[PDB]
Amino acid sequence: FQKYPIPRYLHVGQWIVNKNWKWNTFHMFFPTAILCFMVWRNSMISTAKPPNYGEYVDPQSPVAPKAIKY
Amino acid sequence: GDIRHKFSNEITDDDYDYQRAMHVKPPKEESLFQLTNILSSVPVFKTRFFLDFIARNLDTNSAVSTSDFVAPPRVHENSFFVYHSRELGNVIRKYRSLESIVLPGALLTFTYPLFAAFVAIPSYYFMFNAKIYEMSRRFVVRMDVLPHLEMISVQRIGAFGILYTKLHRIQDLEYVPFDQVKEQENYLWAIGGHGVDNQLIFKDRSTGEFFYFERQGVWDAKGLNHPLLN
Amino acid sequence: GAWNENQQHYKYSKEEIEAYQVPMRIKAGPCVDTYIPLKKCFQENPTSFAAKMLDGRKGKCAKEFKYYNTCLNHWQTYENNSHVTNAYWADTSKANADGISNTYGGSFRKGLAWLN
């Protein structure tokens, strides 16, 4: 579509180009990556995976599912 | 208006040569492995035996039409020629000749001829009856006029590629408007009425026979401008 | 001897089935005894999906795949009754006369298109 003038006072995103977008991309990507790394560690503390190939669950081990003793 | 000459890295016409196999363009050069170059370079094609084989096989020059006027051989001694089909009649006859080899071949070579017939029945009724066959039945392959009877001899194509000639009285001929036969036969005129003249449709009213004439067919002025045919 | 038996004639326990991660579809069938060595060999012989999809002998996993393929053929034939069905298809009159399986033969209709 043909470009048309945009009011200077309006904080809209129509045909908005930031000449310094590279540093903004750097400083919006890397700290986001660090935040997600911290959240990833926190969630990896509480993570469950089935036994690997060749590994079985001993039914009498504490890891095995348990039933309530009334 | 093109400005590719102003720039060096701009694409040239020689780069647009792989598109010649996909885009029609007047010839510029002959490649090493082009068929013409192969035929004109290998000496085995210069030998007389290949030249004689080519000059005596494939299409013959006797079958090539040598004029824009043709007089087909008379069907009867007294009859005079009026109209003849050119290529649609040939294609119709070659298509209906398939029933003479493919249909028996289907019986003798298909594991399930009943399956073949069960799939062919709806193909005929839903697609092929209104496409080729019914047009062929009403197609006028040839039309001459016998003056002693004051009748028209119409030669048509039958089921297995047959040819048969029927006589229709001139006074019983009527003109059938396309709008008169438009809605009742819309499917035929939708998929199988393009090669025949829908604005030139006739009918023998005694038997309800429809006469369709090919758009590419040839008409004789002498026969058409006859007092019997007005 | 039996098609479900593997090369070593060894039956696998529930713990071994769990440890070797047998798919439930294979577990439902009777071919776990022949499937388990094949999966063990494939784990010991990691190959790309193209290798499995192209090799007809399954490469290194040859004997294990032979045993598993015999078991699979028998298993899918019996789950299909395809032997009886093909016997009745080849000659419906002779199969009925011989009484291969009256239960299937009493409700068998070949179809008009297939040679009546």
Next chain:
Amino acid sequence: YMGNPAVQSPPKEFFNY
């Protein structure tokens, strides 16, 4: 009941703020 598709003159007497 439904609105009138016909073009009507602007109201002269109507409740206002």
Next chain:
Amino acid sequence: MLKNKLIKFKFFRFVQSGFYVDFIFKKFSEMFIRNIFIYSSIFFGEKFMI
């Protein structure tokens, strides 16, 4: 079959319009919206009942 009504634009239009299912559903939805929200809820419900 020399006469076919499945190639006329009437049948083609019918099929292209999705068998008129959307049209019928939207007509019934307008019926419901008018008869429930306006006449029954705000007029009968609020003007009369409330």
Next chain:
Amino acid sequence: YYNIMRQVSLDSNPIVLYQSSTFTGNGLQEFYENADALTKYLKLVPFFLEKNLYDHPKQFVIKMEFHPQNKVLSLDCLTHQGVLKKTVNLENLIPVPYEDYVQFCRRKLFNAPLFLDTEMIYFNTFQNEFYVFDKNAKWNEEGINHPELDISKLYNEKAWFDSLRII
């Protein structure tokens, strides 16, 4: 529209309009004798393949006479079997370009030899076939400028622009 046929004859005093320089001879035997004519014939072999196998209606004209009294053309065309004489009614000939000639055939034609005159295709609408001339040839300037060959007598907008459409 309708291919109404009219009887035609010859004037017995034809005016030469076109003559292929390479294909000067009685027929295919003398074409074999000529070294250049033989090479051109071998290059025209795929042209004949398109003509026969692909059912592309085409003729390679090596000579052309004109009869103004009957308004007829007297083409002598070359095919894989030799030279054949064809008479074309003047009103049945229209100009057509290389793109129309190629796109008429649904099959992809073989790469054309360099001696085909791609700018001068002539379509016979009655016979529905193309005529292609040779690049190295003598066009009789006096012959082609005959008053009966003038477009003011021959040009018909509907036939020249609207009759032949390739879709």
Next chain:
Amino acid sequence: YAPQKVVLRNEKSGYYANPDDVARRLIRLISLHDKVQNPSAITLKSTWSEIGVDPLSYVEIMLEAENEFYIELADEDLERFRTVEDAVEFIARNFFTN
């Protein structure tokens, strides 16, 4: 980029397409009609009746002009056109003329 200052809408010449190009294309399209005897007698100030265009011929010519200029013209506007100059002015000032 934007000059960072307030800049108003530029009306410029007021034509979204070249008026002379539009007029020439329209006159060429009109001359294509079978009932227009003299293409060289067509002027922007000329009337449709003056250039021998009946109402139905005008309808056909305007439909083909709509096809050519990549726009559609309302019947009220089409009846509003009294001269080729008016038609060209309306087409050139249209934002969708192409």
Next chain:
Amino acid sequence: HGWDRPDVPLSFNPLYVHKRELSIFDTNMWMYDQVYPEYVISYNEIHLVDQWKGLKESFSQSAYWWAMMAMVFGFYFINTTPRQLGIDTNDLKGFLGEYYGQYKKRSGIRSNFLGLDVTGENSIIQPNYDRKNGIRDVIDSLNADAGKRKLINLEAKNFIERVEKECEQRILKKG
């Protein structure tokens, strides 16, 4: 290119002028906008005057597809034999076994583990181990089909054993 186009005109968003009274009986029946207001529901198939005429037209034109479906079903019905489909008969103690085991053990109606004098029946969502409906029909059909396939395999084995015995008798008898 080739012309200095002015800016996009304000006519691209024409101002809508209200010429009619906005009835309260059409409340929210219109998408209101100062440019191009619309009715809340669009009827592209307005050539059908009503929804009843639309239903009549739909059922009249859908008859062709009913006929085509009938033709396809007839073609596949006079030319195809029903297949041997069902649950895997090598695992009947699984999906089929668990269903009947649950309907047999009746563990949902046992006594409370504390003696609270309340069982599973004392709830809005309560067990019913004598229901005999729902998916039980499909379960019974699957079990019957599995039994039928097992019987077919057994009959085939018996037939082959009988054929082998008959051949042995025939060859041995002649000597």
Next chain:
Amino acid sequence: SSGNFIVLFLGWELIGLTSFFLINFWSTRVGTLKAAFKAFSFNKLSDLFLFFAILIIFSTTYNLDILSFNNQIYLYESYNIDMFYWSINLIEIISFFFISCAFIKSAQFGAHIWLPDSMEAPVPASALIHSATLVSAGIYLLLRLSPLFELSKYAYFILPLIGSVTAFYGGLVSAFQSDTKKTLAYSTISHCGFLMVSYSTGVLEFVILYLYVHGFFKAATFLCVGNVNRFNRNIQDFKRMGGFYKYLPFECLASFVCMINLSGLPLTLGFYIKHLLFIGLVESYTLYPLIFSSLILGAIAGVFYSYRLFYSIFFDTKKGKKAIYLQASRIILNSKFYSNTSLASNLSITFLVLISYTVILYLYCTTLNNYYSLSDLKSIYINNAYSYFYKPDYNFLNAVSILNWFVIILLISVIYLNWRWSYYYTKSIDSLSKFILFSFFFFIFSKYIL
């Protein structure tokens, strides 16, 4: 990726609202607002159904973990809920609500009407919505809760019937659509119905394969038709197209590949998934005649819409406007940079097709190979549908042959039928005759002589 029903409901509401925002991208238009609001209303009804199903599950089991619910729902099969004057089975009511929620999102007959109106969204949005995601949410609901639907009589009756009806309806309407986006939307409706049928077959591997193939090739076709629409300047109907092969060469060729894969044409991955669908179709349904007829008519409908879209867009006559063609063919524009699309678009579509082929081949090798190497699907309902894939009988082969020959006859019809006068009309009939004779002789020679 939900682990609980609460994360499931959160994702349901999130996809609903994000689809509403995607559909209503042209916020300045109220004509877009009404379509987005219809989609929003259907999403809210789906949310109601999902919430009520989750509430019933919680009131029954006091549990929201999906694994725990799946592994213990079998204990509650013999249960009923006293709702008003009726005693509805516990599995039946939960399955009814989940199935209604799935049918609204994964567009089925009746609840499909929002999907054709959701084409006001930009082409990338429509590609994401229709290929996967929004219309695959119901398939995810069915697959994630597979043990629940194995024990439901309502599922057994409603999944195949509604799936077949939806497939037939969508394919048939797509075969008649002149808009490219509407054509692909109705194709998506048809393939969602086919996915429902595939789930009703009891084989989840076939469902996964069909989902992957349809998503990949529908997305690629959506991108191609989006480039075509942009070139045509926001005119989506192909009645104003034709001759775009020269202006959009890459679009033409990529669209050809993606349509022959998508429409289930023979010798393609779509053909494989359709054949797998017909392998496992159960024949014990009361309404099997209608179901099977609808499935056949919807499976044969891919040829029509694929051929119509491709030929009308690229190789028909020039039905478009002169401004579209002439402005892109000026001699000044001739350069090595000339393109009516973007190099980035071309590379994206090429890599999408390549990765789609690789992933579909990997899935086929993991599932359809003799050595079954797929991971556990957490389903204990194992039928014998794989037997006909491994060791089929002759009757099934002959039935699939019937289907293949129906497809062949439809191909013959679409290729050779002349709906308009042409100079090649006679030669087209001649070509058909010689093709029939050549096919007969080729069959004779390849089977008996040598």
